[PDB]
Design a protein around this ligand. Structure first.
Ligand SMILES: CCn1cc(NC(=O)C2CCC2)cn1
Length: 185
């Protein structure tokens, strides 16, 4: 791909984070803590899952960023509406305001309804995410495999401002403690 020149500097929004997440000083890394991280509750925090939003809001243009997923067993990545549900149980779908892919139990899937199997020969260590607001496109790229396409959501109905979306996943296994990291430009 040739989307690198739309690179944007993403930072994480602490106020949206599940109360167990630990965000680095530079707001570029996030991991699951082993306990509640001693913050007050608020209506923005994702309550049920280890999710957090980027601070940036996008309503036009083309945007690109990269995320490091090295040695994780489970994670979700993509974008979502600013007004997505924060509390209780929900599925990641375009109907609910999410455009995402994930790793779960050694398989990669796109968050369609129902979910779509992805075909990845080289397990990615870094994922590129491209958003074209006007075109209604969200695309995912395998940076480990020379930028190869993973998945394209087209005919997207954003219906609001978009925010970068992250889920570090649970760590029931003891094998999923590693962080998500926003990679430098
Ligand atoms: C909540 C509004 N809404 C949006 C959609 N569909 C999409 O965004 C497309 C991406 C692939 C299907 C369905 N309902």
């Amino acid at each position: 791909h040739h989307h690198h020149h739309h690179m944007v500097h993403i930072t994480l929004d602490r106020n949206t984070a599940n109360s167990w997440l630990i965000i680095s000083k530079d707001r570029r890394q996030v991991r699951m803590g082993d306990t509640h991280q001693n913050v007050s509750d608020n209506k923005e925090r994702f309550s049920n899952y280890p999710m957090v939003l980027g601070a940036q809001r996008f309503s036009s243009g083309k945007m690109y960023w990269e995320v490091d997923v090295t040695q994780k067993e489970a994670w979700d990545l993509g974008v979502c509406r600013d007004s997505v549900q924060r509390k209780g149980q929900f599925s990641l779908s375009p109907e609910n305001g999410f455009w995402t892919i994930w790793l779960w139990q050694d398989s990669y899937e796109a968050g369609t309804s129902p979910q779509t199997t992805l075909h990845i020969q080289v397990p990615p260590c870094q994922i590129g995410i491209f958003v074209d607001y006007e075109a209604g496109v969200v695309s995912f790229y395998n940076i480990t495999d020379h930028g190869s396409l993973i998945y394209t959501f087209s005919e997207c109905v954003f219906a609001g401002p978009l925010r970068p979306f992250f889920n570090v996943g649970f760590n029931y296994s003891g094998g999923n403690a590693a962080p998500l990291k926003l990679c430098p430009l």
